[PDB]
Design an enzyme around this catalytic site. Structure first.
Site, PDB file in Angstrom:
ATOM      1  N   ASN A   1     -26.351 -20.625  51.221  1.00  0.00           N
ATOM      2  CA  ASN A   1     -26.967 -19.361  50.836  1.00  0.00           C
ATOM      3  C   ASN A   1     -28.477 -19.484  50.624  1.00  0.00           C
ATOM      4  OD1 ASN A   1     -27.843 -16.974  49.684  1.00  0.00           O
ATOM      5  ND2 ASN A   1     -26.233 -16.868  48.126  1.00  0.00           N
TER       6      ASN A   1
ATOM      7  N   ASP B   1     -29.073 -15.833  54.129  1.00  0.00           N
ATOM      8  CA  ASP B   1     -27.755 -16.224  53.646  1.00  0.00           C
ATOM      9  C   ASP B   1     -26.713 -15.967  54.741  1.00  0.00           C
ATOM     10  OD1 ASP B   1     -25.404 -16.714  52.213  1.00  0.00           O
ATOM     11  OD2 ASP B   1     -25.468 -14.779  51.190  1.00  0.00           O
TER      12      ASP B   1
ATOM     13  N   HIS C   1     -25.036  -7.993  59.622  1.00  0.00           N
ATOM     14  CA  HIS C   1     -25.461  -9.240  60.253  1.00  0.00           C
ATOM     15  C   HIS C   1     -24.844  -9.246  61.650  1.00  0.00           C
ATOM     16  CE1 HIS C   1     -27.682 -12.173  57.890  1.00  0.00           C
ATOM     17  NE2 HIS C   1     -27.066 -11.743  56.802  1.00  0.00           N
TER      18      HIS C   1
ATOM     19  N   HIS D   1     -31.146 -10.024  58.580  1.00  0.00           N
ATOM     20  CA  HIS D   1     -32.500  -9.791  58.069  1.00  0.00           C
ATOM     21  C   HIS D   1     -33.367 -10.312  59.215  1.00  0.00           C
ATOM     22  CE1 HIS D   1     -31.033  -9.145  53.994  1.00  0.00           C
ATOM     23  NE2 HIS D   1     -30.388 -10.296  54.044  1.00  0.00           N
TER      24      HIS D   1
ATOM     25  N   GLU E   1     -37.521 -14.987  55.897  1.00  0.00           N
ATOM     26  CA  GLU E   1     -36.840 -15.184  54.617  1.00  0.00           C
ATOM     27  C   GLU E   1     -37.047 -16.624  54.181  1.00  0.00           C
ATOM     28  OE1 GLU E   1     -32.892 -13.778  53.790  1.00  0.00           O
ATOM     29  OE2 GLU E   1     -32.817 -15.000  51.966  1.00  0.00           O
TER      30      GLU E   1
ATOM     31  N   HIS F   1     -36.143 -17.708  50.940  1.00  0.00           N
ATOM     32  CA  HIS F   1     -35.422 -17.690  49.673  1.00  0.00           C
ATOM     33  C   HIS F   1     -35.359 -19.020  48.916  1.00  0.00           C
ATOM     34  CE1 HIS F   1     -31.874 -15.434  47.533  1.00  0.00           C
ATOM     35  NE2 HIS F   1     -32.768 -15.915  46.686  1.00  0.00           N
TER      36      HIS F   1
ATOM     37  N   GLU G   1     -36.094 -11.541  50.803  1.00  0.00           N
ATOM     38  CA  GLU G   1     -36.165 -12.605  49.814  1.00  0.00           C
ATOM     39  C   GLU G   1     -37.169 -13.717  50.100  1.00  0.00           C
ATOM     40  OE1 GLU G   1     -31.788 -13.203  49.999  1.00  0.00           O
ATOM     41  OE2 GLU G   1     -31.755 -12.369  47.969  1.00  0.00           O
TER      42      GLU G   1
ATOM     43  N   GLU H   1     -29.895  -3.190  49.248  1.00  0.00           N
ATOM     44  CA  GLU H   1     -28.582  -3.822  49.103  1.00  0.00           C
ATOM     45  C   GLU H   1     -27.933  -3.408  47.782  1.00  0.00           C
ATOM     46  OE1 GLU H   1     -30.396  -7.922  51.148  1.00  0.00           O
ATOM     47  OE2 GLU H   1     -28.843  -8.071  49.600  1.00  0.00           O
ATOM     48  N   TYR H   2     -26.662  -3.017  47.838  1.00  0.00           N
ATOM     49  CA  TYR H   2     -25.935  -2.629  46.627  1.00  0.00           C
ATOM     50  C   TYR H   2     -24.436  -2.662  46.904  1.00  0.00           C
ATOM     51  CZ  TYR H   2     -24.436   2.088  48.129  1.00  0.00           C
ATOM     52  OH  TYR H   2     -23.844   3.164  48.752  1.00  0.00           O
ATOM     53  N   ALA H   3     -23.637  -2.684  45.840  1.00  0.00           N
ATOM     54  CA  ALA H   3     -22.179  -2.704  45.965  1.00  0.00           C
ATOM     55  C   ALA H   3     -21.690  -3.892  46.791  1.00  0.00           C
ATOM     56  CB  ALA H   3     -21.690  -1.390  46.581  1.00  0.00           C
TER      57      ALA H   3
ATOM     58  N   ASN I   1     -22.589 -26.673  50.653  1.00  0.00           N
ATOM     59  CA  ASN I   1     -22.289 -25.347  51.178  1.00  0.00           C
ATOM     60  C   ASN I   1     -22.028 -24.371  50.036  1.00  0.00           C
ATOM     61  OD1 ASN I   1     -19.247 -24.950  50.591  1.00  0.00           O
ATOM     62  ND2 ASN I   1     -19.340 -27.010  51.486  1.00  0.00           N
TER      63      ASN I   1
ATOM     64  N   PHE J   1     -19.009 -17.349  49.649  1.00  0.00           N
ATOM     65  CA  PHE J   1     -20.121 -16.406  49.655  1.00  0.00           C
ATOM     66  C   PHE J   1     -20.627 -15.863  50.979  1.00  0.00           C
ATOM     67  CE2 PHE J   1     -20.417 -17.262  45.131  1.00  0.00           C
ATOM     68  CZ  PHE J   1     -20.726 -15.979  44.672  1.00  0.00           C
TER      69      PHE J   1
ATOM     70  N   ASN K   1     -18.665 -11.083  52.526  1.00  0.00           N
ATOM     71  CA  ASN K   1     -18.982  -9.957  51.636  1.00  0.00           C
ATOM     72  C   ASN K   1     -18.803  -8.628  52.365  1.00  0.00           C
ATOM     73  OD1 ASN K   1     -22.025 -11.807  51.248  1.00  0.00           O
ATOM     74  ND2 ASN K   1     -20.100 -12.197  50.169  1.00  0.00           N
TER      75      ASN K   1
ATOM     76  N   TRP L   1     -22.147 -12.285  41.050  1.00  0.00           N
ATOM     77  CA  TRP L   1     -22.607 -13.528  40.448  1.00  0.00           C
ATOM     78  C   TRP L   1     -22.875 -13.401  38.956  1.00  0.00           C
ATOM     79  CZ3 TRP L   1     -24.372 -11.273  44.913  1.00  0.00           C
ATOM     80  CH2 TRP L   1     -25.511 -10.446  44.821  1.00  0.00           C
TER      81      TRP L   1
HETATM   82 MG   LIG Z   1     -31.164 -14.964  50.730  1.00  0.00          MG
HETATM   83 NA    NA Z   2     -23.435 -13.669  51.068  1.00  0.00          NA
END
Ligand SMILES: [Mg+2]
Ligand code: NA
Ligand SMILES: [Mg+2]
Ligand SMILES: [Mg+2]
Ligand SMILES: [Mg+2]
Ligand SMILES: [Mg+2]
Ligand SMILES: [Mg+2]
Ligand code: NA
Ligand code: NA
Ligand code: NA
Ligand code: NA
Ligand code: NA
Ligand code: NA
Ligand code: NA
Lengths: 1011, 1011
Positions: free
Chosen positions: A90, A189, A345, A379, A404, A406, A449, A525-527, A585, A589, A592, A987
């Protein structure tokens, strides 16, 4: 030179970016968008060889095929072919963080292709090769000669091969590096793969050619008039006889056309662009483009000579629409949008990150069928066909730069570094240069991110300068920085603030009114739909609808990034992080999605469809008020079906045509509904039906629905006294109750109903006992791990409290004879290390009709974490084929995710009462059930329940669904109460207070009998 | 790789930019800014070899010295050593425009140095080499091994040599390319040279080091309190015992200090910068920095261990000042600035573009001595010492990025191209990273003449993001684009609009109030001082003072870019474009300074000093009102000297101390001035004197002055009737007039006074004739050329009209005898191809005193271009040593450039009546003269005049001043009227209407006699 370890070098000899070209040499083909002989696909079988590092590649490879190489299909990710393992991480970078360096052991994919090139292509014009996607960097050779280099895995890299090709046989050699300095900007991610995963092709252009063209559409106040402006650029030799004609088409009708010689207007002291020209066409009453009605025109750009000889033609679909932010609102064609979006994605369970038309079309159809009208390219820029499809099917798109970082510490370490501005600017600028003519793209995104750095501000301004037709957004650094026109937080909650230092996530309602703030808010991003999730989804939509400036968001996310692996028998199974030996790893995750990797819907998808409906309803007396949330279209393909039923029994129904103007209302008067004789609750159910098929749906498609409780008649009639009376036999170890061939046994040591008999057949495999726990959902676990426990996670709080270890202690067990029944009374105390967690007091009343009435009263210590559930469970000996129930359904629904569920009589095969989440957990619950039927059994009351061949224990001990095994009999969980599932994020605790079992005292009653 | 033909590669292995470092290992040394043992200079004698291209350089050069090489001094431009020719081109690129390519024949300078390195430098830490300036690109090798590459000729390039060095002797090999893709961004109007023209040095830093530090100063509303904020960054191993201490010193007094461990505040979800720390020091009543009073503090940054052990220290001078734009005004410490600036190129007549401290100091002293308070770095970052000197002496600086693409078509072709953003960003970002701690830098500039492209907007925003303490300006694309906080036009006129398409130059007064405009306006360039120029300078300052938002500008420019050459006899002379065989070239256009290349002042400098005065005066009765234009200082080093004189004869004088608060006023009552007996005009002259010496001026320095005409007594007394009478001898060919040993002879064929006698001594070498032309000034010529005529230029209009060819035609010539005198009457007509241009009617009246009264009346055809002058001229036989006159002086002054000149009695050596402009033209004029004395001659009246050993003809036929030769006798030009010289620009007519001789009819009278 090790160019792959230098952010200063992102390419060598790469051609300038531009919109999609086909170089048609026939205008009609360009108008109709038919295939072009000048654009050839090189997709197919190529030769491939894997190496541990570039220094291991033999020089001979540049001259001729390696006999050890294999023949593989391209495009493809070499991990999907098994040459090495795909890695799922991630945040943490898959390589040591030491920019701009990458591992010396750098997996290298050597691709090669022998192909024919016709003499005619080399006699004149320019022949270029186009790699739409190469992950993450690569060097190119043609017939043994080095051509160039390129980075950025998500945008096309083009090279001129005119001087390298020979008539006849030619050979391409492409050395693809898995890691490069470009990887520092590709920390999304998702699975980390590599290879030539997008199309490869050859394009032939004349020497004098259209090198670029920009299309814009401006409107007057009421959009009754528009001016299409097309700037066209050329390369080659300029001659006064050269001309450019831009024609606009509506189907086969030419609505406008403009012709002119090259030579733009004066721009500064040195003059203007002699190699450019801008055509302006007037369009009266243009048909506007929107996700509601994707009206499109065709723009054909012809480069020709004055005497009429065509040199070449390019073209694109044009959507007349205006995107602008005014007074804090994002408007499309002057109307405030309500974004029903989702992040998507590019993922395929078998092909990895290689996309194909059929999968893209499938996603778009499912999205529109489930009331989505927007998608975010999380992304990175997508496969070029994606935008074409979004233009035509109608979906608002957020095009995002492939940036990204992150895993950096802090997140903006690179993005605030001027030395990384060059690499970053190419990822933003080349994206804009490629997709700026697509009407579906309504917003540009600077990436994801990567904190907030000065590089973001510079690139934000660059876009505003070159393309003022679209807002620019970026979430990094707090979601409301100077680099974003839209407040676009990820996982900000509706009412609850999350005051993190520096980058707080305020309640979205509160965010809008912070001192000085005026921008619109749309969550990028939500839910988080990870596993059994989407609890609280309706809370977001109620807010979106009430607040003008809350204009929606994009759910995270569309499809599970699970990958297919095979067992010894060749049976495929869904795998996630770590299943390929990849380590470290982030396990589950990567999953989703609202749908499984094979596009099979998760139960949550229906909740999204319902909350995202375009028609709202209100009931007053006999009148149904229908309100349209469409901004542009009338309801010309909608019919309203209504139905009234008494406890699942239909009494009346009908249909009324819908005639609602956008944003309008319609009143529908229901006929006189007859009063039912029998007692019970009358329910009204309405649903909008689309009689006619569309490009995205079949005839009879249901787009919206709603239910209301009507009149209710409480039953006041007493049951006919059964002349029969149960018998109570008593031993020092049991309390037995017989009534015909029926027998009820209560273990006086445990205090539970340990067995029931219908003749000589046992009914239970496991005693009927209380249950206060559930196999932990992904949301209950969060990021907690065996070696890295998160004490704040619900599952960890339950474990620490002893909820899963708690042992039942019998406090009392008595029996009594009544004038017409036997009464069993029990009391248990669940403790853990001297602490009394729960106290359960029950009474079982068996009467002459063989019906057992169970009354349960539970006390929950106020200082123990609120329990996941309060109910009973047992393993039934029976295994039936059907499950019939009167309650919310037909799909899985939980307390905070049941608005989409309808109350009625449902009947499904046992297997459908189980949701195959890749990562096993509590699942299949159905709430608000008044009656449940399975085999010879029938339970009545007001409870929630799930029933399957898997115990809660097996579910919480199994990591993958394919490892589950049907147990003996059927496990039944009947709850008086069940905790919400949450999902605002996965999380940290996300179950809202109103859905937590915190009352301290609970009561529920059941009636068990033989159906 | 040909990295010099790829804008994508601007460097290889170059270290990050940063503020000046010295790596002191002793804090006291850092506080006192004394030399650092860790910062060594490699300047001196190096080995040099010239090659026609990089492919001609022998490989052996990398290993050892080329015996053919010469030993030359570094820094230096190899053109100044004679290896090849320097090229002077303005707009047109010196190479074919074909980006990113440069000529295959690319002059290559091979430099090398064998040097020693103390072993202690290699036993620990990092040893880096720093090249402050290499024109235009270069590769570096150390002991035969390739180190790196770098571009951008005006910023330092640093490389780590730690792994390439050895103890003792080492050898550097630097291959410098004259042309590179970087050249496309270095098209400034100046000599095109190359080589290692700035310092070279070695810096030793510890492994754990201060890698960067930013200093900022914020204030409260009244500036009575300030907070100095210092962000410090490190590299190397992080240890908890590391500490950073920042101390602020006011002289030898430490005013504040702060210590803290590394670890910044949280900035995002991933945390903060562990390798950074920000110290904040409070300062009460800080002494503020300004060009008026350059108060400075010393900031010492110490990297050390908790136990007090010093690791290293860096430091800088700190100037407490705030720069901000508010309500349309540019404020410094809350007060609106009035920019008295000038553009300054780094130029030396002998050393080319190599700068040295003495020359820099000389320029700064002359600038401040002539009332300048600001300088613009046209058009690139300067030598680092420049900013240090500006900080200490006190001058506002506009730091400008080295980006100019003037020769592109259109001008923004590259700057609007995203592919050139990387190259451009490095030139802007590395400049900011280097100079951001200098208080003298108050404004950032994005470059010069590169149109307006999206790259400019991106970089504009980048700066606003990283440094909000300074406004950003840029003139390209119209001077008021979205990439500038200041309207900064070049050569926009005061009242006259120049409506060019797309990029108009509006009158500056009008520009300010254009619909919606609110920004302050400061010209980045104005008053082109090319040759005899600066006409109309006072018009700008009157406007600057009246309009709050007109806050000044920068004159173009400081010093002539003329170069020294020696003739056969090794004698030096000033050369310009084309004198080195360089072609094509732009000749004289490289000379636009207020001072000659050797820093000798041009007459125009005094006009600038006067108009830029800081004290204004008004006279009312006996009261002098003094107003201060200083914003911060009181007149604590000023004295007012006043003087009253009658026609040059002093009658009274005195001095009054000046006590004026900034922006304040002071009233000075003059004592009762006595009435003069003799007739004449009384003049009042005041001047501000600085009694005490300063860092920039000597005691007695005159900073300002002003004059007023007081009472005047017209002469009504008739001259005593003479007892002698002149005699008229008439002949067929002549009209002779005798008086004692004096004789006047009027040629009856020509109609002119052809000779005058005093005994046997002839007075004239050439007859006294009318003159309506002048040897064309640079402003009269503009860009017109022999092969490329500009019909709009004044000189071309005069030539086309025949003004220079016009022949005098005698219309009438008569003689008469009066009771006490002889009257000669003449009338001439100057024609050209049948067109009568002018008609001159004169009368000469000679009386018994030997005085000749000449009355002239001229008619000028309304349809002929207005004449450059209306006067008489002749070649006097006499050659005296002195020139005495009562009029405006003492320096050269013209109608539109004479405000600085004062009326009085002046006496100078003949040579001072000639201005040695490198390009010869009309010069040395003195206006408002009532009496002129030369030898035995005396002329009285009200005229303008110039007198020298050079005829107007020789001046207009000679291209260089060193080619001029004193003619026989002395040429005298006495004008009744003279046209203005102009100068708003030097490429289009710039003489304002009020200074053009357009009346149609003119009258003036002279009296010639013996002194
Ligand atoms: Mg990320
Ligand atoms: Na994810
Ligand atoms: Mg690279
Ligand atoms: Mg509902
Ligand atoms: Mg280069
Ligand atoms: Mg220029
Ligand atoms: Mg004056
Ligand atoms: Na809303
Ligand atoms: Na309808
Ligand atoms: Na599980
Ligand atoms: Na002003
Ligand atoms: Na010039
Ligand atoms: Na004073
Ligand atoms: Na001349």
């Amino acid at each position: 030179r090790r160019d792959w370890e230098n952010p200063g070098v992102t390419q060598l000899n790469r051609l300038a970016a531009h919109p999609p070209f086909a170089s048609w040499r026939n205008s009609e083909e360009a108008r109709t968008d038919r295939p072009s002989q000048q654009l050839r696909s090189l997709n197919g079988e190529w030769r491939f060889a894997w190496f541990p590092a570039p220094e291991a590649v033999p020089e001979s490879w540049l001259e001729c095929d390696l006999p050890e190489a294999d023949t593989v299909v391209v495009p493809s990710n070499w991990q999907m072919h098994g040459y090495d393992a795909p890695i799922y991480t991630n945040v943490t970078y898959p390589i040591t963080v030491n920019p701009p360096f990458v591992p010396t052991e750098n997996p290298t994919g050597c691709y090669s292709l022998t192909f024919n090139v016709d003499e005619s292509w080399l006699q004149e014009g320019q022949t270029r090769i186009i790699f739409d996607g190469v992950n993450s960097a690569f060097h190119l050779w043609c017939n043994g000669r080095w051509v160039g280099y390129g980075q950025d895995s998500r945008l096309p890299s083009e090279f001129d091969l005119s001087a390298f090709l020979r008539a006849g046989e030619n050979r391409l050699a492409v050395m693809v590096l898995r890691w490069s300095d470009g990887s520092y900007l590709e920390d999304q991610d998702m699975w980390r793969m590599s290879g030539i995963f997008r199309d490869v092709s050859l394009l032939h252009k004349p020497t004098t050619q259209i090198s670029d063209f920009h299309v814009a559409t401006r409107f007057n106040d009421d959009f009754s008039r528009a001016v299409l402006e097309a700037e066209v650029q050329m390369c080659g030799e300029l001659r006064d006889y050269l001309r450019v004609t831009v024609s606009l088409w509506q189907g086969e009708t030419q609505v406008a056309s403009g012709t002119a010689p090259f030579g733009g207007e004066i721009i500064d002291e040195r003059g203007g662009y002699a190699d450019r020209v801008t055509l302006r066409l007037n369009v009266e009453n243009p048909k506007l483009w929107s996700a509601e009605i994707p009206n499109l025109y065709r723009a054909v750009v012809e480069l020709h000579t004055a005497d009429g000889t065509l040199i070449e033609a390019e073209a694109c679909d044009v959507g007349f629409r205006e995107v602008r932010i005014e007074n804090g609102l994002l408007l499309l064609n002057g109307k405030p949008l309500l974004i029903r979006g989702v992040n998507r994605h590019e993922h395929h369970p078998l092909h990895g990150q290689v996309m194909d038309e059929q999968t893209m079309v499938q996603d778009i159809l499912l999205m529109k069928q489930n009331n989505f009208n927007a998608v975010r390219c999380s992304h990175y820029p997508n496969h070029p066909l994606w935008y074409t499809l979004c233009d035509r099917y109608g979906l608002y798109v957020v095009d995002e730069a492939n940036i990204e970082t992150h895993g950096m510490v802090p997140m903006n370490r690179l993005t605030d570094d001027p030395r990384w501005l060059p690499a970053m600017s190419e990822r933003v600028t080349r994206m804009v240069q490629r997709d700026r003519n697509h009407p579906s793209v309504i917003i540009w995104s600077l990436g994801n991110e990567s904190g907030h750095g000065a590089n973001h501000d510079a690139l934000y301004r660059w876009i505003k300068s070159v393309d003022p037709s679209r807002p620019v957004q970026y979430e990094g650094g707090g979601a409301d920085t100077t680099a974003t026109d839209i407040i676009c937080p990820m996982y900000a909650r509706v009412d609850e603030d999350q005051p993190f230092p520096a980058v707080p996530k305020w309640s979205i309602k509160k965010w809008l009114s912070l001192p000085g703030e005026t921008r619109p808010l749309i969550l990028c991003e939500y839910a988080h739909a990870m596993g059994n999730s989407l609890g609280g989804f309706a809370k977001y939509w109620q807010a979106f609808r009430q607040y003008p400036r809350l204009q929606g968001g994009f759910v995270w996310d569309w499809v599970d990034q699970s990958l297919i692996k095979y067992d010894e028998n060749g049976n495929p199974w869904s795998a996630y992080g770590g299943d390929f030996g990849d380590t470290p790893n982030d396990a589950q995750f990567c999953m989703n999605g609202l749908v499984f990797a094979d596009r099979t819907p998760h139960p949550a998808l229906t909740e999204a469809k319902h909350q995202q409906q375009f028609f709202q309803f209100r009931l007053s007396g006999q009148t149904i008020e229908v309100t349209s949330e469409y901004l542009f279209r009338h309801s010309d393909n909608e019919l309203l079906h209504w139905m009234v039923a008494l406890d699942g029994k239909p009494l009346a129904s009908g249909e009324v045509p819908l005639d609602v103007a956008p944003q309008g209302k319609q009143l529908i008067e229901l006929p006189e509904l007859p009063q039912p004789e029998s007692a019970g609750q009358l329910w009204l159910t309405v649903r909008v039906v689309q009689p006619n098929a569309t490009a995205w749906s079949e005839a009879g498609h249901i787009s919206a629905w709603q239910q209301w409780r009507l009149a209710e008649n409480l039953s006041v009639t007493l049951p006919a006294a059964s002349h029969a009376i149960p018998h109570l036999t008593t031993s020092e170890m049991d309390f037995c109750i017989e009534l015909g061939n029926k027998r009820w046994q209560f273990n006086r040591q445990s205090g539970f109903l340990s067995q029931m008999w219908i003749g000589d057949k046992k009914q239970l495999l496991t005693p009927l006992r209380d249950q206060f726990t559930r196999a932990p959902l992904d949301n209950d676990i969060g990021v907690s791990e065996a070696t890295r426990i998160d004490p704040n996670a619900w599952v960890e709080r339950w474990k620490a409290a002893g909820h899963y270890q708690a042992e039942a202690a019998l406090l009392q067990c008595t029996a009594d004879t009544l004038a017409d029944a036997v009464l069993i009374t029990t009391a248990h105390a669940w403790q853990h290390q001297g602490k009394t967690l729960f106290i359960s007091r029950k009474t079982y009343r068996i009467d002459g009709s063989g019906q057992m009435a169970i009354t349960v009263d539970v006390e929950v210590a106020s200082d123990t974490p609120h329990p996941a559930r309060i109910g009973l469970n047992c393993q039934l000996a029976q295994v039936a084929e059907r499950v019939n129930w009167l309650g919310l359904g037909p799909q899985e629904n939980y307390p905070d995710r049941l608005t989409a569920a309808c109350f009625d009589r449902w009947d499904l095969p046992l297997s459908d009462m189980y949701t195959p989440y890749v990562f096993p957990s509590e699942n299949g619950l159905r709430c608000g059930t008044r009656e449940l039927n399975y085999g010879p059994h029938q339970w009545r009351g007001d409870f929630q329940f799930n029933i399957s061949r898997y115990s809660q224990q097996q579910l919480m001990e199994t990591s993958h669904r394919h490892l589950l095994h049907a147990e003996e009999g059927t496990w039944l969980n009947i709850d008086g109460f069940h905790m919400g599932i949450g999902g605002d994020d996965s999380w940290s605790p996300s179950v809202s207070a109103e859905f937590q079992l915190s009352a301290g005292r609970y009561h529920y009653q059941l009636v068990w009998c033989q159906k």
